[PDB]
Design a protein around this ligand. Structure first.
Ligand SMILES: Cc1c2c(n3c1CCCN1CCC[C@@H]1CNc1cc-3ccc1C(N)=O)CC(C)(C)CC2=O
Length: 208
């Protein structure tokens, strides 16, 4: 297990998201689904030039999996996935610029719900989650687990769990007062409202 410090700007962003009073938390799901959609777009495009990139799985979809016992909501996709370099360095480097712009926009009166316009919507996960675990598998790399409960650091390790083939799993360990997002009716409501035109099948798993 390797432990890393967040870019200073990203740490600041995470603290803002965790500490700011903002009741419209439901937008987190839209942002994560958007991330998945983008990842699916990417593997789909790449497969047009190199069909073998789908040897790791041809189905392009998104699964939403609530678990009341573990108090987790999991967003699963069969998108392009992320390499170790993506997880440790490269996405954070990109996120640095977006974070700065977002935090400046907020100071100018922008709304937290606009986070996606700045390319850092992933971090909206911390509106509802005390810990986020990201399991990911890219064609060119091994299966990794990224994890952070904020506080300025994150970890990355090779994943021992069951193989995914290709794609990403975002596991939200929900805050105690955010369990409404484990309810079928609530998730359906949010998907219908914010994600009705996503171009991939979204399957909401039922509990038990
Ligand atoms: C930015 C950013 C970040 C993450 N994703 C994106 C967003 C930017 C990177 N994204 C654009 C299209 C495909 C790539 C990789 N795919 C994903 C990226 C993100 C989230 C989900 C997925 C996912 N579900 O595949 C996650 C993490 C690296 C842990 C932290 C972070 O800064």
């Amino acid at each position: 297990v390797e432990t890393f410090a967040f870019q200073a700007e990203i740490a600041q962003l995470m603290s803002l998201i965790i500490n700011t009073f903002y009741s419209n938390k439901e937008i987190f799901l839209r942002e994560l689904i958007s991330n998945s959609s983008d990842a699916l777009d990417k593997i789909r495009y790449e497969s047009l030039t190199d069909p073998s990139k789908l040897d790791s799985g041809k189905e392009l979809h998104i699964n939403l999996i609530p678990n009341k016992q573990d108090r987790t909501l999991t967003i699963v996709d069969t998108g392009i996935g992320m390499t170790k370099a993506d997880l440790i360095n490269n996405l954070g480097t990109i996120a640095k610029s977006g974070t700065k712009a977002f935090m400046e926009a907020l100071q100018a009166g922008a709304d937290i719900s606009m986070i996606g316009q700045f390319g850092v919507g992933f971090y909206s996960a911390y509106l509802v989650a005390e810990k986020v675990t990201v399991i990911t598998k890219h064609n060119d790399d091994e299966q990794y687990a990224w994890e952070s409960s904020a506080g300025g650091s994150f970890t990355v390790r090779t994943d021992t769990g069951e193989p995914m083939g290709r794609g990403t799993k975002v596991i939200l360990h929900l805050k105690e007062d955010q369990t409404e997002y484990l309810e079928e009716r609530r998730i359906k409501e949010i998907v219908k409202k914010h994600s009705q035109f996503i171009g991939y099948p979204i399957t909401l798993f039922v509990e038990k």
